[PDB]
Amino acid sequence: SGAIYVGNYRVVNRHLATHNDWANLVWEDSSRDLLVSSTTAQGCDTIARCDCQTGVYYCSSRRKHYPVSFSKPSLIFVEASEYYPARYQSHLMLAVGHSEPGDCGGILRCQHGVVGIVSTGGNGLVGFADVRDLLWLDEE
């Protein structure tokens, strides 16, 4: 589990969004596994605006942060998981590491702040939903 908290925004995996996230929806995209909902309190987090290919993610299934290299966000075939069928996901970054379904929502960070959230796993990769393209997360 987990989310990004930037301004009056809460960024979560679409597949883990609550009734309340949907009830206060801002934006959502199933191709990205992303949902954004409005928040009453303001958030501690800063979004990266950059093309860094190195950073650190939280792995909740190892209670550990791991430094990774990762591909630029792209349109990737992900095999079938407990929360999705085998499908094309867009704006996805892949690194070599550990990701179980429960690890979705853990942060990936670089020197510029939050890059994305764990969204895929299996066959020794960890996939992350890029949010660096979402410039509207920074104001309003």
Ligand X SMILES: CNCc1ccc(C(F)(F)F)cc1
List residues forming the annotated binding site for Zn(2+): 50, 52, 110, 112
| CA–CA dist 71, 3 (Å, integer) | 22
Catalytic status, residue 130: no
Is the CB of residue 125 less than 8 Å from the CB of residue 65?
A: no
Q: Which of 8, 24, 90, 125 binds ligand X (CB under 6 A)?
A: 90
Does residue 117 bind Zn ion (CB under 5 A)? no
Q: Which residues, in sequence order, are bridge partners of residue 28?
A: 35
91 contact partners, CB below 8 Å, separation of at least 6: 31, 32, 34, 73, 74, 129, 130, 133
Does residue 74 bind ligand X (CB under 6 A)? no
Is the CB of residue 25 less than 8 Å from the CB of residue 42?
A: no
Min CB(77)–ligand X separation in Å: 14
Q: Which of residues 11-70 bind ligand X (CB under 6 A)?
A: 28-31
Is the CB of residue 47 less than 8 Å from the CB of residue 6?
A: yes
Does residue 129 bind Zn ion (CB under 5 A)? no
Catalytic status, residue 104: yes
Min CB(46)–ligand X separation in Å: 26
Report the interface residues with ligand X, using CB under 6 A.
28-31, 90
Q: Which residues are catalytic?
A: 15, 33, 104
